[PDB]
């Protein structure tokens, strides 16, 4: 019960830190107990990979649907505050992508059906504007979002002090971004009524 | 004359489809010149691979640039029909990351600069919203965008046809990206509000 966490924890630490060739034995290890638990619990390596796997998916889509259901504004800067707190998951994700093995690509998958999913409940909250094509809309901001943060590591000082960069993070990024997404970037709608109006003829005919 | 550019954009192909380690000969060959002539244009394998960093940037920057300065739409649609001319760019764009030797780092950090540059255009121009940290601005939706589109081709289901992936990136991505960026996402300034509250003070004091 409690049992299967202290493993699933620890898998994600492991995995997090030296990558999926990792030992299960190590794992048995940090999580301090034997290996056969670890393999009763999990069944195989692949077992637990996707047990991990839709483990994160789960941490993120449960923390962002949580600020996405609040129009309470100290549930987003608490959920701020323990920012760095997040380091031993994305520290998983970003293995995942490098690792691409299509275990990880049925993974973002799952993770953009998590973003359609909290994007409505916060449509329906009233926090998010609703869209002509949410489906669309969702895909946009989870390729983006995502990509954008993996890219920010890469280019970071330190791309494995994941506390440090998701400090950084927070502190570069915010801000910039909640403008963008509460006052838009473009002047008028000119290009957006443009681009649809090629786009509706284009489904015409 | 056209000699420095024959060459160049003979390099771009190369790096692009074989990578760094390719042949200086095959560049050459590819190009239907000399190794020496090569050599006379660019001085070291180093010096020619900033020449092409150099000209992707520029190229984009020409590009967007154009965009944002014109109210005209009709701008915007037609460089849209070309966007699987730049696969060649995009194609060498992303082996320098992949191969994130300091010299692609120094890239990302003039794009960045180069965002700035013409957002500050289209602002002046009208076309975008001014911002309340501009830097901060350009430097989110660089990382976004970009890491965006990176992410697009590695869960791409032929991650080499950049042509394709790019006609796939514009029928996916194009529309729900102007409409976030036109219409915003977030509901109220709520969030926007709170956070910057949180980070004057933290300024203030």
Same mark, same amino acid.
């Given at each position: 019960?409690?049992?299967?966490?202290?493993?699933?924890?620890?898998?994600?630490?492991?995995?997090?830190?030296?990558?999926?060739?990792?030992?299960?034995?190590?794992?048995?290890?940090?999580?301090?107990?034997?290996?056969?638990?670890?393999?009763?619990?999990?069944?195989?390596?692949?077992?637990?990979?996707?047990?991990?796997?839709?483990?994160?998916?789960?941490?993120?889509?449960?923390?962002?649907?949580?600020?996405?259901?609040?129009?309470?504004?100290?549930?987003?800067?608490?959920?701020? !505050?323990?920012?760095?707190? =997040? @380091?031993?998951? *994305?520290?998983?994700?970003?293995?995942?992508?490098?690792?691409? &093995?299509? $275990? #990880?690509?049925?993974?973002?998958?799952?993770?953009?059906?998590?973003?359609?999913?909290?994007?409505?409940?916060?449509?329906?909250?009233?926090?998010?504007?609703?869209?002509?094509?949410?489906?669309?809309?969702?895909?946009?901001?989870?390729?983006?979002?995502?990509?954008?943060?993996?890219?920010?590591?890469?280019?970071?000082?330190?791309?494995?002090?994941?506390? !440090?960069?998701?400090?950084? =993070? @927070?502190?570069? *990024?915010?801000?910039?971004?909640?403008?963008?997404?509460?006052? &838009?970037? $473009? #002047?008028?709608?000119?290009?957006?009524?443009?681009?649809?109006?090629?786009?509706?003829?284009?489904?015409?005919?």
């Amino acid at each position: 019960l409690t049992a299967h966490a202290r493993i699933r924890e620890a898998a994600i630490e492991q995995f997090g830190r030296h990558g999926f060739g990792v030992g299960l034995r190590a794992i048995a290890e940090a999580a301090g107990v034997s290996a056969a638990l670890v393999i009763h619990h999990f069944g195989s390596k692949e077992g637990l990979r996707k047990a991990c796997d839709d483990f994160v998916a789960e941490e993120i889509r449960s923390s962002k649907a949580a600020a996405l259901k609040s129009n309470d504004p100290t549930t987003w800067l608490a959920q701020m !505050a323990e920012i760095e707190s =997040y @380091a031993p998951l *994305m520290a998983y994700l970003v293995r995942s992508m490098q690792s691409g &093995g299509e $275990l #990880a690509k049925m993974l973002w998958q799952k993770m953009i059906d998590n973003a359609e999913e909290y994007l409505d409940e916060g449509v329906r909250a009233g926090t998010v504007k609703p869209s002509r094509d949410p489906r669309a809309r969702a895909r946009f901001l989870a390729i983006t979002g995502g990509g954008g943060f993996l890219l920010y590591l890469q280019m970071h000082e330190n791309p494995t002090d994941l506390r !440090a960069a998701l400090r950084d =993070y @927070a502190h570069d *990024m915010v801000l910039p971004s909640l403008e963008v997404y509460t006052e &838009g970037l $473009l #002047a008028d709608r000119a290009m957006y009524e443009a681009f649809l109006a090629e786009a509706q003829q284009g489904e015409a005919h």
